[PDB]
Amino acid sequence: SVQWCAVSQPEATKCFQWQRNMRRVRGPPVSCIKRDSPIQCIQAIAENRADAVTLDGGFIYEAGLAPYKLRPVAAEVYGTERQPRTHYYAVAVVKKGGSFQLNELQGLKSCHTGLRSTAGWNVPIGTLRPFLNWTGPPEPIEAAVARFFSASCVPGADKGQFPNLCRLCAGTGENKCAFSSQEPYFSYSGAFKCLRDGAGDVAFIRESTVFEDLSDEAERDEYELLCPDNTRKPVDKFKDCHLARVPSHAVVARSVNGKEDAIWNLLRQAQEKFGKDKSPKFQLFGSPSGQKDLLFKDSAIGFSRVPPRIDSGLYLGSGYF
Ligand SMILES: [Fe+3]
């Protein structure tokens, strides 16, 4: 029986909901362990206290190094059901009717999904590297992006060490700039919320975020995309206007006694019984109102098995930072 690692209290509530719905229809069992961050779950999985967790590209990287050595066993599948993909597009959204392009971003206000995440850090900080005042190590990269943008919200960053990076974060007290749902500018939806609220000028998020979060068509029209050739196209044109195409979030397990057939059998049947438009009792790719992407991404349509003997580095693609 597969033990999933829940990162927050609403993830755990979904996990327990998942567990009782699996027992209800005679699927393979799933138990639940609770932890406070993605790194604690990576550590729990390698310490044999958990067996699975869905991670973002930046954390798939960190799970694949020693002493953890976690490996991707199942990628999340996005796109439509008639046209699926195991990849996403890191984009930079801004309010329409603007002067600026990608190269004139100095001194503006930035909204990020989190420190060391794919579309919100690794990708945009990599694309904007020529524009920075970086002389290389041992100076941390945070300090140079702290002089670039006048204020940001980069969740997970140091409030003491880089105060400018947490300034636009809207969390209260000990949650402001925290890497969790308690900070409301955290993740894809939170970073988009930071642009919507007029706090930042640009949000570095993925391509579907404005289609998810803005159900009303008039308001999606108020935003546009900053393409890397230095032009501005609309939000429906991400396929030609993006910072990078990045590999999808994957479930990671141990590379030694990882139980990956058990993990897959649980995922295939969970997708079959509780996928997009399957059951009205449980949704594996939906979350309750006010919460976003618990356990897996909302509106992902399924899973795809990673072939054997592929580690984190082979998964991430050659051409990573
Ligand atoms: Fe991501």
XYZ file of C-alpha atoms and ligand atoms in Angstrom:
322
model
C 0.000 0.000 0.000
C 1.369 3.321 -1.292
C 1.895 6.167 1.158
C 1.542 9.561 -0.458
C 3.313 12.551 0.964
C 1.000 15.483 1.551
C 2.585 18.899 1.682
C -0.190 20.790 3.496
C -3.313 20.245 5.598
C -5.656 20.665 2.605
C -3.532 18.151 0.662
C -3.881 15.632 3.509
C -7.658 16.166 3.578
C -7.724 15.379 -0.138
C -5.437 12.413 0.451
C -7.774 10.965 3.061
C -10.645 11.604 0.689
C -8.676 9.743 -1.999
C -7.988 6.845 0.396
C -11.636 6.331 1.384
C -12.784 6.560 -2.209
C -10.261 3.906 -3.228
C -11.493 1.527 -0.513
C -15.059 2.306 -1.610
C -14.647 0.938 -5.110
C -12.040 -1.719 -4.363
C -9.050 0.005 -5.924
C -5.492 -0.316 -4.675
C -4.973 1.269 -1.266
C -3.334 4.613 -0.547
C -2.350 5.800 2.927
C -1.251 9.368 3.866
C 1.705 11.000 5.566
C 1.799 14.702 6.322
C 4.854 16.981 5.957
C 5.394 20.783 5.761
C 7.409 21.365 2.522
C 8.409 19.540 -0.672
C 11.887 18.871 0.724
C 10.542 17.182 3.844
C 8.553 14.809 1.634
C 11.654 14.114 -0.472
C 13.429 13.340 2.786
C 10.519 11.223 4.052
C 10.444 9.174 0.862
C 14.176 8.426 1.097
C 13.957 7.625 4.806
C 11.257 5.033 4.015
C 8.333 6.890 5.579
C 6.563 7.726 2.361
C 6.622 6.286 -1.130
C 5.332 8.979 -3.488
C 4.958 12.710 -4.149
C 4.274 14.892 -7.146
C 7.050 17.423 -7.670
C 7.725 20.405 -9.905
C 10.812 20.369 -12.230
C 12.927 22.392 -9.806
C 12.289 19.901 -7.058
C 12.631 16.806 -9.225
C 16.186 18.106 -9.618
C 16.789 18.411 -5.904
C 15.282 14.972 -5.188
C 17.662 13.337 -7.666
C 20.834 14.375 -5.866
C 22.454 12.639 -2.913
C 21.649 11.429 -0.509
C 18.079 11.176 -1.814
C 18.293 9.838 -5.345
C 14.585 9.920 -6.098
C 13.509 9.245 -9.646
C 10.549 10.149 -11.873
C 8.130 7.310 -12.223
C 5.030 9.007 -13.604
C 4.592 12.296 -15.418
C 1.459 14.368 -15.160
C -0.256 14.718 -18.527
C -1.761 18.069 -19.578
C -3.485 19.494 -22.616
C -6.792 18.341 -24.012
C -7.867 14.702 -24.202
C -7.773 14.769 -27.984
C -4.306 16.443 -27.896
C -2.237 15.456 -24.816
C 1.263 16.556 -23.777
C 3.793 15.740 -21.038
C 5.134 19.310 -21.080
C 4.171 22.885 -20.263
C 5.191 26.388 -21.287
C 6.781 28.875 -18.877
C 5.341 32.304 -19.719
C 5.438 35.903 -18.582
C 2.049 37.555 -18.268
C 1.429 41.310 -18.047
C -1.503 43.746 -18.227
C -2.472 44.661 -21.824
C -1.820 48.113 -23.260
C 1.720 48.342 -21.956
C 4.927 49.758 -23.317
C 7.397 47.167 -22.073
C 8.912 43.986 -23.489
C 11.206 41.320 -22.037
C 14.451 43.311 -22.291
C 13.153 46.437 -20.574
C 12.232 44.730 -17.333
C 14.747 46.506 -15.112
C 13.289 48.102 -12.009
C 9.719 46.765 -12.538
C 7.742 44.676 -10.005
C 7.901 40.861 -10.262
C 5.469 38.124 -9.197
C 7.020 34.622 -8.918
C 5.535 31.166 -8.226
C 8.370 30.282 -5.858
C 12.116 30.173 -5.411
C 13.713 27.414 -7.489
C 10.562 26.305 -9.298
C 10.515 25.854 -13.043
C 8.314 28.501 -14.635
C 8.595 30.957 -11.733
C 12.361 30.896 -11.123
C 14.673 28.546 -13.038
C 13.150 29.520 -16.327
C 12.745 33.318 -15.990
C 16.001 33.890 -14.101
C 17.777 31.817 -16.785
C 16.206 33.752 -19.648
C 16.948 37.126 -17.967
C 20.598 36.297 -17.119
C 22.284 38.742 -19.587
C 20.317 41.632 -18.129
C 21.524 41.003 -14.575
C 24.448 42.465 -12.563
C 25.824 38.992 -11.712
C 29.573 38.413 -11.497
C 29.131 34.756 -10.598
C 29.718 33.032 -7.200
C 29.931 33.042 -4.291
C 27.320 35.783 -4.452
C 23.857 34.180 -4.490
C 21.648 34.734 -7.544
C 18.870 36.188 -5.336
C 20.915 39.306 -4.614
C 21.342 40.115 -8.295
C 17.654 39.679 -9.101
C 17.034 41.769 -5.976
C 18.736 44.720 -7.695
C 17.063 44.042 -11.021
C 13.403 44.205 -10.043
C 12.527 46.967 -7.572
C 10.291 44.607 -5.615
C 9.210 41.005 -5.965
C 7.373 38.189 -4.291
C 9.523 35.100 -4.591
C 8.139 32.646 -2.035
C 10.646 30.527 -0.205
C 13.294 33.323 -0.309
C 15.039 34.851 2.752
C 13.240 37.829 4.344
C 16.426 38.883 6.124
C 18.906 38.120 3.340
C 16.856 39.436 0.383
C 14.076 41.696 1.769
C 13.207 43.112 -1.655
C 12.270 39.596 -2.874
C 9.455 39.242 -0.320
C 8.173 42.819 -0.312
C 5.168 42.287 -2.539
C 4.228 39.068 -0.772
C 0.854 39.379 0.931
C 1.135 36.746 3.676
C 0.483 37.699 7.269
C 3.185 37.691 9.929
C 5.198 34.504 9.748
C 3.567 33.440 6.469
C 4.582 36.395 4.341
C 6.892 34.982 1.700
C 6.436 31.441 2.979
C 6.574 28.517 0.506
C 2.974 27.348 1.120
C -0.725 28.150 0.572
C -0.701 30.397 3.629
C 1.089 33.005 1.536
C -1.563 33.900 -1.069
C 0.875 34.888 -3.812
C 2.390 31.400 -3.792
C 2.326 29.174 -6.871
C 0.872 29.560 -10.363
C -2.426 31.010 -9.175
C -0.915 33.143 -6.409
C 1.635 34.707 -8.709
C -1.119 35.465 -11.203
C -3.128 36.919 -8.277
C -0.194 39.261 -7.563
C -0.531 40.673 -11.102
C -4.374 40.803 -10.905
C -4.164 42.719 -7.642
C -1.878 45.386 -9.229
C 1.018 44.475 -6.964
C 3.454 43.387 -9.684
C 3.923 44.312 -13.321
C 4.776 40.863 -14.515
C 3.964 37.334 -13.441
C 6.090 34.342 -14.411
C 3.623 31.511 -14.631
C 2.597 28.656 -16.898
C 0.270 28.884 -19.897
C -3.078 27.737 -18.569
C -3.251 29.830 -15.378
C -5.217 32.689 -16.942
C -7.660 30.269 -18.496
C -8.243 28.497 -15.222
C -8.435 31.417 -12.873
C -10.226 33.865 -15.138
C -13.431 32.171 -16.268
C -14.726 35.398 -17.760
C -13.393 36.109 -21.290
C -13.376 39.938 -20.933
C -10.880 39.791 -18.124
C -8.507 37.364 -19.942
C -8.403 39.966 -22.715
C -6.906 42.430 -20.225
C -3.681 40.391 -20.128
C -1.104 39.523 -22.751
C 2.206 37.742 -23.113
C 5.778 39.037 -23.330
C 7.451 37.011 -26.089
C 11.227 36.481 -26.138
C 11.733 38.159 -29.516
C 10.597 41.272 -27.640
C 7.003 41.615 -28.830
C 3.640 41.268 -27.035
C 1.160 38.590 -28.158
C -2.102 37.518 -26.441
C -2.670 34.734 -23.910
C -4.041 32.303 -26.457
C -0.753 32.456 -28.360
C 1.562 30.772 -25.760
C 2.625 28.125 -28.336
C 4.694 30.728 -30.131
C 5.120 33.092 -27.223
C 6.909 31.425 -24.317
C 10.119 31.474 -22.305
C 10.666 27.705 -22.517
C 8.791 24.455 -22.982
C 9.357 22.524 -19.761
C 8.826 18.911 -18.679
C 5.704 18.254 -16.626
C 5.462 17.637 -12.872
C 6.184 13.998 -11.966
C 5.602 11.582 -9.173
C 8.916 10.646 -7.686
C 9.787 7.490 -5.833
C 12.926 5.773 -4.620
C 15.420 4.444 -7.151
C 15.970 1.419 -4.851
C 12.917 -0.432 -3.340
C 10.649 2.350 -4.644
C 7.561 0.187 -5.282
C 7.017 1.656 -8.690
C 4.593 -0.891 -9.996
C 2.406 -0.307 -6.913
C 2.673 3.437 -7.456
C 1.676 3.084 -11.116
C -1.200 0.673 -10.484
C -2.591 3.130 -7.966
C -2.236 5.980 -10.447
C -3.723 4.220 -13.480
C -6.800 3.068 -11.598
C -7.193 6.405 -9.780
C -7.088 8.095 -13.180
C -9.573 5.588 -14.606
C -12.083 5.791 -11.787
C -11.557 9.405 -10.694
C -10.156 11.290 -13.694
C -11.581 14.083 -15.819
C -15.356 13.676 -15.982
C -15.371 10.156 -14.496
C -16.872 10.290 -10.981
C -18.902 13.010 -9.333
C -17.844 11.778 -5.892
C -14.081 12.314 -6.168
C -11.893 14.259 -8.578
C -8.170 13.392 -8.597
C -7.371 16.584 -10.573
C -9.670 19.104 -8.845
C -9.479 20.830 -5.436
C -12.072 22.543 -3.143
C -12.856 26.297 -3.606
C -10.194 28.595 -2.219
C -7.494 25.919 -2.577
C -5.428 25.080 -5.709
C -3.617 22.006 -7.078
C -3.760 19.645 -4.127
C -1.608 16.475 -4.669
C -1.601 16.881 -8.444
C -2.288 19.728 -10.850
C -5.901 20.822 -11.513
C -7.027 19.990 -15.056
C -4.243 17.557 -15.795
C -5.944 14.714 -17.640
C -3.884 11.729 -16.555
C -0.528 10.105 -16.059
C 2.159 8.741 -18.351
C 4.712 6.218 -17.199
C 8.365 7.138 -17.271
C 10.512 4.443 -18.918
C 13.046 2.630 -16.758
C 16.643 3.736 -16.192
C 15.849 7.453 -16.497
C 16.904 9.682 -13.654
C 16.059 13.288 -12.827
C 18.596 14.703 -15.288
C 17.382 12.599 -18.184
C 13.815 13.520 -17.307
C 14.467 17.279 -17.157
C 15.892 17.429 -20.657
C 19.343 18.365 -21.855
C 19.308 22.125 -21.746
C 18.586 22.689 -18.090
C 20.170 25.758 -16.459
Fe 5.699 23.953 -12.295
